Amino acid sequence: SMSVKKPKRDDSKDLALCSMILTEMETHEDAWPFLLPVNLKLVPGYKKVIKKPMDFSTIREKLSSGQYPNLETFALDVRLVFDNCETFNEDDSDIGRAGHNMRKYFEKKWTDTFK
Numbered sequence: 001s002m003s004v005k006k007p008k009r010d011d012s013k014d015l016a017l018c019s020m021i022l023t024e025m026e027t028h029e030d031a032w033p034f035l036l037p038v039n040l041k042l043v044p045g046y047k048k049v050i051k052k053p054m055d056f057s058t059i060r061e062k063l064s065s066g067q068y069p070n071l072e073t074f075a076l077d078v079r080l081v082f083d084n085c086e087t088f089n090e091d092d093s094d095i096g097r098a099g100h101n102m103r104k105y106f107e108k109k110w111t112d113t114f115k
Contacts, residue, residue, distance in 0.1 A: 011070075011071070014070070014071045015063070017071075017113055017114070018068070018071055018074045019063060020113075021106070021110065021113060022078075024105075024109060025078070025102065026060070028102060028105060030097075030098040030102055031098075031102065032098070033095045033098050034055055034056050034081050034098075034099075034102065035057060036055055036056075036057050037053055037055045037058060038050070038053055038055070045088075046088065049087065049088065050084050050088060052080060052084070054080040054081045054084060055081060056081065058077075059074070059077050059078060059081070062077065075110060078106055079103070079106075081102075082099045082100075082102060082106075085098070085099030086099060
């Protein structure tokens with residue numbers, strides 16, 4: 001509350017560390033469905049169904065331009081990428097499996113870096 005604070009966690013490396021995680025996600029062999037925004041002109045149903053499209057290149061631009069106020073807002077966008085994927089793709093599809101794999105990959109890096 002006012003004048004009552006938990007000890008100050010060092011957040012000075014968060015930006016660099018989120019960048020590193022994101023590089024690792026970008027270079028994963030199963031990243032290909034997520035690298036670029038879904039083409040809303042060419043994929044029927046995507047625009048209407050997925051109310052908040054997100055992809056790694058969009059995260060990278062937001063990260064590089066100071067648009068994440070904290071590491072939780074960064075995680076929220078990464079998770080959004082996989083939540084969107086699950087919304088639109090059957091589990092038993094290459095893309096559906098890619099999304100599950102990448103989410104797992106992400107969550108482990110996240111826990112290991114920050115928890």
